[PDB]
Amino acid sequence: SEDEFLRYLWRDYLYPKQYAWVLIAAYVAVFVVALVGNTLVCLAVWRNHHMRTVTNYFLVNLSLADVLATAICLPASLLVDITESWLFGHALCKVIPYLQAVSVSVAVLTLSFIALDRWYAICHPLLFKSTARRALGSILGIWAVSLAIMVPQAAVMECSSVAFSVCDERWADDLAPKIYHSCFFIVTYLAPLGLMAMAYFQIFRKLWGTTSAEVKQMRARRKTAKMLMVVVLVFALCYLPISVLNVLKRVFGMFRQASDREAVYAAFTFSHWLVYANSAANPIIYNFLSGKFREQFKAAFSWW
Ligand SMILES: CCCCCCCC/C=C\CCCCCCCC(=O)O[C@H](COC(=O)CCCCCCCCCCCCCCC)COP(=O)(O)OC[C@@H](O)CO
Ligand SMILES: CCCCCCCC/C=C\CCCCCCCC(=O)O[C@H](COC(=O)CCCCCCCCCCCCCCC)COP(=O)(O)OC[C@@H](O)CO
Ligand SMILES: Cc1cc(NC(=O)Nc2ccc(N(C)C)cc2)c2cc(F)cc(F)c2n1
Ligand SMILES: Cc1cc(NC(=O)Nc2ccc(N(C)C)cc2)c2cc(F)cc(F)c2n1
Ligand SMILES: CCCCCCCCS[C@@H]1O[C@H](CO)[C@@H](O)[C@H](O)[C@H]1O
Ligand SMILES: CCCCCCCCS[C@@H]1O[C@H](CO)[C@@H](O)[C@H](O)[C@H]1O
Ligand SMILES: CCCCCCCCS[C@@H]1O[C@H](CO)[C@@H](O)[C@H](O)[C@H]1O
Ligand SMILES: CCCCCCCCS[C@@H]1O[C@H](CO)[C@@H](O)[C@H](O)[C@H]1O
Ligand SMILES: CCCCCCCCS[C@@H]1O[C@H](CO)[C@@H](O)[C@H](O)[C@H]1O
């Protein structure tokens, strides 16, 4: 009676309201910070002439994928998690996921090149000379590949006619989605991250009668090595949920029992927010583990 009302008030109104608020709150925070974050990350590079290494041009490219995700995809990501209907029509059903898929590729690819350029620069020197000119050439290819291989993704997207629309992959047969999503979890999460991890372990064992300038070089390479591993670990953790969730859905046909549909909606919703949290996370990573970015942020915060 008197206390059963108080409980029944909670799940039909109090919980649904407190849940929806937290959803829009975390999304607006990530949207703003990730937007303000990566924007300042570019100005620290366009302004501070000393901070233009091969790694920073790649990290600037990492912001470019994050913004495409945040500005275009992220607003679309919020409305679907709230209503779970597609409201941007047949065509944005293909564009938004494609940009989002392309931004993942450009991201995970850029991180591998920063690992690869550093693995040669620190572990196998003057094998390849990596100048900013070759660093920028690499950055253009990432988009050429990301824009291509996410194309088959765009083809599978179809907006479902069945009084509200839904956007989802249209697979002609059971086996293709298993192979497609098995291949791309390997290609764009596990294979890059596992390789990049083995790369950075080789760097840690190295860095952790040489000239005073050389140890000055080691002191800078550790501050960058320390910072970059944080960026990769943050990336794997952020993308671990949605990446595993997608394989369970598409390869193992999981999340098809309707009993805890809220728990499944909830599960995926946090997984989607974690992706954009990585975009807002990275600029914060630079401010703490990079003393030159940190001064660029304080200098930018005072003028604006
Ligand atoms: C070291 C890292 C490794 C990678 C390194 C980079 C390698 C880069 C390679 C190539 C770049 C070019 C790729 C571009 C391929 C684009 C292919 C594509 O869009 O396929 C569509 C159909 O796909 C579809 O529905 C089907 C798409 C899904 C796949 C179907 C089969 C399942 C298995 C698939 C195989 C496993 C793939 C996994 C990759 C990770 C085409 O039809 P569409 O709509 O135009 O209508 C017909 C009409 O328009 C044709 O004129
Ligand atoms: C995908 C592969 C699978 C990933 C997931 C892996 C899952 C697990 C399976 C096997 C891994 C273990 C095998 C090795 C076991 C032996 C120990 C180990 O960790 O391997 C290190 C070597 O590899 C290493 O540094 C690794 C080399 C790092 C290379 C970094 C590449 C940059 C990343 C960009 C890639 C883009 C690709 C595109 C994909 C779309 C050893 O060093 P260490 O000093 O003891 O001896 C140096 C000595 O070899 C000198 O003669
Ligand atoms: C409906 C739907 C789906 C998504 N799928 C994903 O992100 N898949 C995804 C991401 C990475 C990988 N790897 C293999 C690394 C595989 C699959 C969404 C992602 C978002 F960020 C936001 C949304 F609103 C989403 N909505
Ligand atoms: C339906 C759908 C999908 C999305 N994304 C994705 O499928 N990504 C994605 C998918 C596959 C891969 N592989 C590497 C295989 C990578 C990324 C969406 C993203 C959004 F931001 C908003 C939406 F409404 C979305 N809807
Ligand atoms: C953005 C927020 C979106 C909605 C999230 C709802 C999560 C579960 S609360 C929901 O409240 C309803 C009120 O009637 C009840 O019928 C259901 O049994 C109960 O599960
Ligand atoms: C026509 C199809 C699109 C191709 C455009 C990009 C061509 C490659 S530039 C090349 O990229 C490498 C990536 O590893 C770097 O290592 C090099 O320094 C850089 O010179
Ligand atoms: C005139 C020819 C027009 C062809 C239009 C193709 C549109 C996408 S076909 C694509 O084919 C895959 C088979 O590989 C299936 O798995 C996918 O579900 C399906 O979307
Ligand atoms: C006939 C369909 C229903 C039975 C179960 C099929 C399971 C397919 S798993 C799929 O097998 C491919 C084989 O090549 C690999 O390429 C992929 O990596 C892997 O994920
Ligand atoms: C504790 C178990 C939780 C669920 C995991 C089993 C999913 C059964 S479907 C089946 O699963 C195979 C692997 O088991 C895949 O190889 C096939 O492609 C897929 O069709």
Curated annotation (Swiss-Prot):
Residues marked Important for responses to orexin (site): 10
Residue ranges of the region described as Required for response to orexin-A: 2-15
Cytoplasmic topological domain residue ranges: 42-56, 115-134
Extracellular face residues: 80-93, 157-178, 250-264
Membrane disposition: Multi-pass membrane protein
Locations listed in the record: Cell membrane
Binding residue positions for suvorexant: 246
Any GO BP: regulation of cytosolic calcium ion concentration
Transmembrane region(s): 21-41, 57-79, 94-114, 135-156, 179-200, 227-249, 265-288
Domain of life where this protein originates: Eukaryota
The keyword Isomerase is assigned to this record: no
GO molecular function, one term: peptide hormone binding
Keywords: Cell membrane, Disulfide bond, G-protein coupled receptor, Glycoprotein, Membrane, Receptor, Transducer, Transmembrane, Transmembrane helix
Keyword Transmembrane helix recorded: yes
One GO cellular component, as annotated: plasma membrane
Cysteines joined through disulfide linkages: 93-167
Note: The antagonists suvorexant and SB-674042 bind at the cognate neuropeptide binding site that is situated between the transmembrane helices and accessible from the extracellular side of the membrane.
Function summary: Moderately selective excitatory receptor for orexin-A and, with a lower affinity, for orexin-B neuropeptide. Triggers an increase in cytoplasmic Ca(2+) levels in response to orexin-A binding.
Entry's free-text remark on domains: The N-terminal region is required for orexin signaling.
Similarity comment: Belongs to the G-protein coupled receptor 1 family.
Protein name: Orexin/Hypocretin receptor type 1
Chain's gene name: HCRTR1
